[PDB]
Amino acid sequence: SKPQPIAAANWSLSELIDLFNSTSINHDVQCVVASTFVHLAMTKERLSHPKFVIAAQNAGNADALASLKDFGVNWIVLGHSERRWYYGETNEIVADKVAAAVASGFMVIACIGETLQERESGRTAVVVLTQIAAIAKKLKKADWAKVVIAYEPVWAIGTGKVATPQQAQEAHALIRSWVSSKIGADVAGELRILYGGSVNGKNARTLYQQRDVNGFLAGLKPEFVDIIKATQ
Template identity: 50%
Template sequence: MSRQFFVGGNFKMNPNCVADKIALTKLLNEAQLDPSVEVVVSPPFLYLIPLKEIIRKEIQLAAQNCYFKDAGAFTGEISPAQLKDAGIPYVILGHSERRTLFYETSETVALKTKAALASSLSVILCIGETLEQRETGQTTDVCAAQLQAVVDVLKESDWSKIVVAYEPVWAIGTGKVATSKQAQDTHADVRAFLAKAVSPAVAAATRIIYGGSVNKGNCQELAVQPDVDGFLVGGASLKPEFVDIINATVKKL
C-alpha cells in the first residue's frame, strides 16, 4: 500500500522570540517543497494562531499537547475542542518529554488520544524506548505496551487519523540516531503489532514515522526504508536543513 510521506517539525519550546518565528516562517514559505509530502509544524501554543495566519497553506499545524477534557477548571491546559475551534488539525501526544518530564503514563496518553479524536483532531502518537531498554532487548515490548494502551480505548476506524512516531528516547536531541536498519526493524515490528492488535488493513495504512536526531545527512538513507513513512524532526526543524529533510525522497537535494 502506498502511504503519503509525512514530515513533522516539533519546535518544542522554541523559537524564543517573534523575530525568529518570522524568519523561520519566511524560510518555509519561500522554499521549494516536495508537493507529495504532508508537512506539519508544531510551534508553542502561543504561536499557533499567528503562524496559521502567515504560513503557506500547504503546511499544516499541530499543537504539542492537549488535555483529555474539553473544558473546565484545568489551569494551564488546552483542550482538543479549543484546538479544533482554532482550526488546528493535528496534536502531538505521548512525546517522551511528556512521559519523562511530566510523568504522563501510557494510559493518560491513551485518554488524550481518544479525546483528541473525538474532537476530530488528527494525532501524531509518539512511542519509544530508553537506551537501557534498547540495550536489554526490550524495544519491541516497550513500543507494544505503549501502543496497547491506545488500542484498548479506540475503535479500528479511529486509526485512520493517527500517525505513529517512533522516537527512541536515547536518540532525541543527543546527536545519536538509530541506524537505518534499527529504524526499519522497529517500524516493521510496530506494523506487525498493529496487524495483530488492530487489523492488517490498519497496519498497512498507518504511517509510522521516525524521530531522533534526523538531519540532512541521514534523512535520505532513512527515507528509503520500506516501513519508514517520514519523520518527526526536533532541533533540525528550526534550521534551513528542515527543507532538505522534507525533500528527502527527492533523489537529488
C-alpha cells in the first residue's frame, strides 16, 4: 500500500490554530505546521493536536539547528521555491542544509521542482532529478528514514494553476523510480513524496488518488483542514 501520508502547511494565526485543535482526524496522517522563527514559540504553546508537529523553515546554521532541537522542534522544511529562485540557494546549498538537519536529529521535508520555463522546454525530468541527486549525494542510505520529498512546480506555487493529476503523478513516479534505482527499492517504497502548488480540498482529493502521491504541502490557511481530509 502507501506509506503514512503527510499534510504540511508552510508558513489570524490564533483562529487558525483553534480550528486545527478542534478538528477530529479519523485516519492515519502526519500533520505538520511550519512557521518562521518569530512564530514558533506561540505555535508550540498553542497547537496541541497530537497528530500535528511543528516545523522550522530554512535554518542552515549548526547552532541554530541545535537550538531548535533543544526547543523541541523536530521537523524542518528546506529548499522551498523562493529559497532557490529568489534567495539563490543552489542545489548544493539545499543539500548541505538537508544533511545538516538530518545530522541534528530532524525529520526533513526537502522541496524540489522545476520552473515555468523548465517545464515548457521539456526539462522537468533533468532538473528535478539533478536537484534530488544533489540531496542524495550528501546523505547515506539510513538517512532516508528522516527524509520527505515535496515536489512543487514553481509555476504552480501561488499562481492558482495546479498540476493536473497526470502531471503530478508523472513527476512523483519519476522521482520514486530514481530513488529506487539509485538509493534502493526499500527506501523508495517508504519514501513520502508530497505534492505542492495551488492545492485546495477538491483538487487535493483527486490528486491523492494517484499512485505515487503521499500527501501535500500547502499554505497555512483555513482550507488546510480539507487538504488533511483529502489524504485518504
